[PDB]
Amino acid sequence: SMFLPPPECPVFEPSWEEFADPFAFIHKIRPIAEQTGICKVRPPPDWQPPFACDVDKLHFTPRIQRLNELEAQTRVKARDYTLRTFGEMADAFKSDYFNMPVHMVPTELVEKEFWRLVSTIEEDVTVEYGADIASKEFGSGFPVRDIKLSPEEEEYLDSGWNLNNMPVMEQSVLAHITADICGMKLPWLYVGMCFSSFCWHIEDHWSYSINYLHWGEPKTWYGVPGYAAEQLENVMKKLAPELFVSQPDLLHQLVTIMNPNTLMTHEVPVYRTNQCAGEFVITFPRAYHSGFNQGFNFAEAVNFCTVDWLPLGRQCVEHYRLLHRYCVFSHDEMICKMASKADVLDVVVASTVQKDMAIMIEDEKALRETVRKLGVIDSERMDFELLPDDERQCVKCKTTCFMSAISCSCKPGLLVCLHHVKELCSCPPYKYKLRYRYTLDDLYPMMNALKLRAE
């Protein structure tokens, strides 16, 4: 037997009452789902968002994909397809590949065959797909405000499970952040075809993700719990070390296709599911996942960050620093933005932010004491949030600075974070300046505002 399917991941069928609040529901299932990394959610029977589109007016630029196990690919990027011409190409591909009608090809068989073809470099199957944020050429699958909407479209505008709303809801910790992240708060649209595949990965900053399949043939998933992320990476490192070489930026991270049986052989727990149209898949923090499409389909996905995630978010940026990997945003900047809005925060959010802020302040206090002992004496307040992100990365570890950094007039524009004072230039430390966003005396009242809000 060449492929043994992993065990099924948890499937939840919440009542209307349980379903109404996505954040409460996710918190409820967390003790179960965090052990499997992914889970599937079937909405109540009458939660049925309307899907309507003109398949001739939606168009997109396709990406192309070779399907070889262990071969390097990248997450970020030909004549356009319309949704109709992509669909015709996709249906004909599958139909011809199997010499069968597409909805007569068993899901078990497509899966078995996927793992055969990626392992056999004699086969050079290539497929195409779409992947992008919503645009005027190809918009969200959920209702958004703008056009006169139907009554049914209007009902789902404000849904918690409308993925456009998820990040700006009250229990989301990104609800009041000002920085423009196209990646972390905007949904991505994915147009799939048979065998088009997403390589093993975790989300930026170890966030959650929620993924909805609007219509079409199923999407097959493999997931690994967060506690096993480093085991998985060690397996990857032994079998494909090329994927771990340092890359110039975040538009360059390498990822790959790998058979889940190979992971399971090395004691990594893996779970599977077939996500059908109308179902959600949720991925938990640091939970590795991968998969492929059974045929022509359309999915929508978004990152999100709950209060549960906050401490993991801090750990992630620490992990990025040790690896010299670029950040998408400054975690500390997000924390201080929320503290500056303490009076309008949800009170549980306020309570959790306060705890992370206390850790941030004590770490910052110790770091500033250490660089003072290195002989850095001069200092000046600096509004880091005003710099383009690529103008405030630590020269050494690439972390996005916000709380503080060291500069030297010798190297105009260059910064190091306070872990890397010795990595900036050859000048003696008294030539350096500590650039800081806030004094410790600024920070304690900000934290107290959170405590008062949390009561």
Ligand X SMILES: O=C(O)CSc1nc(-c2ccccc2)cc(=O)[nH]1
Tell me how long the chain is: 455
Contact of residue 196 among ligand X, Cl ion, Zn ion, none (CB under 5-8 Å per partner type):
ligand X
CA-to-CA separations, 396 to 205, 247, 325, 383, in angstroms, rounded: 19, 14, 10, 21
Cα 435 → chain centroid: 31
Task: Decide if residue 251 touches ligand X (CB under 6 A).
Answer: no
Q: Where are the beta strands (DSSP E) in 4-45?
A: 11-12, 38-41
For 333, other C-beta atoms within 10 Å of its C-beta total: 19
Pick one of 198, 222, 296, 384: the residue that binds ligand X (CB under 6 A): 198
Nearest to 26, CA basis, from 38, 227, 187, 314: 38
Pick one of 164, 207, 274, 293: the residue that binds ligand X (CB under 6 A): 293
CA dihedral 141, 147, 150, 155 (to 10 degrees): 60
Annotated binding site for 2-oxoglutarate: 129, 209, 211, 219
Annotated binding site: 129, 201, 203, 209, 211, 219, 289
**CA gap 257, 310 in Å, rounded:** 30
Nearer to Cl ion, 121 or 347 (CB): 121
Task: Decide if residue 131 touches ligand X (CB under 6 A).
Answer: yes
Nearest to 66, CA basis, from 132, 146, 125, 1: 125
Contact of residue 9 among ligand X, Mn ion, Cl ion, none (CB under 5-8 Å per partner type):
ligand X
Task: Decide if residue 64 touches ligand X (CB under 6 A).
Answer: no
Do strands 38-41 and 11-12 pair parallel, antiparallel, or not at all (unpaired)? parallel
Q: Using CB under 5 A, count the residues that bind Cl ion.
A: 3
Could you tell me which stretch among 55-63, 201-209, 270-278, 355-363 binds Mn ion (CB under 5 A)? 201-209
Could you tell me which stretch among 115-123, 141-149, 180-188, 209-217 binds Cl ion (CB under 5 A)? 115-123
Annotated binding site for Fe cation: 201, 203, 289
Q: Using CB under 5 A, count the residues that bind Mn ion.
A: 1
Binders of ligand X among residues 263 to 282 (CB under 6 A) are 271
At residue 21's C-alpha, the angle toward residues 19 and 26, to 5°, is 80
Task: Decide if residue 87 touches ligand X (CB under 6 A).
Answer: no
Nearer to Cl ion, 113 or 153 (CB): 113
Taking the CA atoms of 346, 351, 354 and 359 in sequence, report the sign of the dihedral they define: negative
Contact letters for ligand X, residues 28-47 (x by CB under 6 A):
----x---x-----------
Nearest to 128, CA basis, from 311, 370, 293: 293
Interface contacts to Zn ion, rule CB under 5 A: 394, 396-397, 408, 410, 417, 419-420, 425, 427
Beta bridge partners of 292: 197, 220
Cβ-closest position to Mn ion: 209
Q: Minimum distance between the CB of residue 13 and ligand X, rounded to whole angstroms?
A: 8
Residues that bind ligand X (CB under 6 A): 7-12, 32, 36, 75, 129, 131, 190, 192, 196, 198, 211, 271, 289, 293, 299, 301
